[PDB]
């Protein structure tokens, strides 16, 4: 099935998922000189004080930190969004080397990794109905650069050794995602898609301008994870990013 290798990677996905060549695919290159400041944009509201993490899972492509989304505990509102979007999970994309790993690029610059916090529109009642709607999801993306350590990331780094291979999971309660956010909430926003199969065109992307810093040692532990299952030959989980897709005369709007 799909992956990130030469024989099942991004350039192959369109055969099973034709929407890969669609009109609003993600990620994209953010040309900062062409993005336009949008005064219609309301301020962004990230309300994560009640967030309830439950578990972390290696899904064979990345790891997901899962939240309890059976109530309005952690939500994203405002900015370009109408309504309330509830946090369901976050995950990362990262590279084999510090010069690559992000999915979005900024003036063609690639970061070492990208964090995605995935939220769904509560008006659609559940995640699987929301991904079938053009405004069903809101994903907050945050770039990672290598430099000083991110203290709030270390509890994630700490548990990765217990979910090395595909299908492993570990308990991950009481994790606070507020510890992953940069100081500034300035952002770029555009309509796009999931960046993995099934590549559904349901996402309002909100990409923060300010990256967070993580240490070399932290990202190195990311790179010790495995795409394969236990007892199979080691395939390091690296370069699980989709490259930039054609913008197709969407306009990227800036909040600043
Ligand atoms: N892991 C993944 N979880 N969600 C994924 C997505 F494809 F939906 S993304 N990269 O947020 O568009 S990747
Ligand atoms: Zn993602």
Which CATH number covers residue 147?
3.10.200.10
The domain of 209 spans 1-256
- How far apart are the CA of 147 and the centre of ligand 1, in A? 25
Long-range contacts of 119-128 (CB under 8 A, 24+ apart): 119/75, 119/76, 119/85, 119/86, 119/87, 119/88, 120/69, 120/85, 120/86, 120/88, 121/83, 121/84, 121/85, 122/72, 122/75, 122/83, 122/84, 122/85, 122/86, 123/83, 123/84, 127/69, 127/88
| 139 Cα nearest atom in ligand 1 | 11
Entry resolution (Å): 1.6
The whole-angstrom separation of Cα 48 and Cα 34 is 32
Binding-site residue numbers for substrate are 195-196
Choice among 1, 12, 61, 119 that is catalytic: 61
Domain count, the chain: 1
| 59 Cα nearest atom in ligand 1 | 1
Ligand 1, CB cutoff 6 Å, lining residues: 61-62, 64, 91, 116, 118, 139, 194-196
Experimental technique for the deposited model = X-ray
């Amino acid at each position: 099935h799909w992956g990130y290798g030469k024989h099942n990677g991004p350039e192959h996905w369109h055969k099973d998922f034709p929407i890969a060549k669609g009109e609003r695919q993600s990620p994209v290159d953010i040309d900062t000189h062409t993005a336009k400041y949008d005064p219609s944009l309301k301020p962004l509201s990230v309300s994560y004080d009640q967030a309830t993490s439950l578990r972390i899972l290696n899904n064979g492509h990345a790891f997901n930190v899962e939240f309890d989304d059976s109530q309005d505990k952690a939500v994203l509102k405002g900015g370009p969004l109408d309504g309330t979007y509830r946090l369901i999970q976050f995950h990362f994309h990262w590279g084999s080397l510090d010069g690559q790993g992000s999915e979005h690029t900024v003036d063609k610059k690639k970061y070492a990794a990208e964090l995605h916090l995935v939220h769904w529109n509560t008006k659609y009642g559940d995640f699987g109905k929301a991904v079938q709607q053009p405004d069903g999801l809101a994903v907050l993306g945050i770039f990672l650069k290598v430099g000083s350590a991110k203290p709030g990331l270390q509890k994630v780094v700490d548990v990765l050794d217990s979910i090395k291979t595909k299908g492993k999971s570990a308990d991950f309660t009481n994790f606070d995602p507020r510890g992953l956010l940069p100081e500034s909430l300035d952002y770029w926003t555009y309509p796009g898609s999931l960046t993995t199969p099934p590549l559904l065109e349901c996402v309002t992307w909100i990409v923060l301008k300010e990256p967070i810093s993580v240490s070399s040692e932290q990202v190195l532990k990311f790179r010790k994870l495995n795409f394969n299952g236990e007892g199979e030959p080691e395939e390091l989980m690296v370069d699980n990013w989709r490259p930039a897709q054609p913008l197709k005369n969407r306009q990227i709007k800036a909040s600043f």
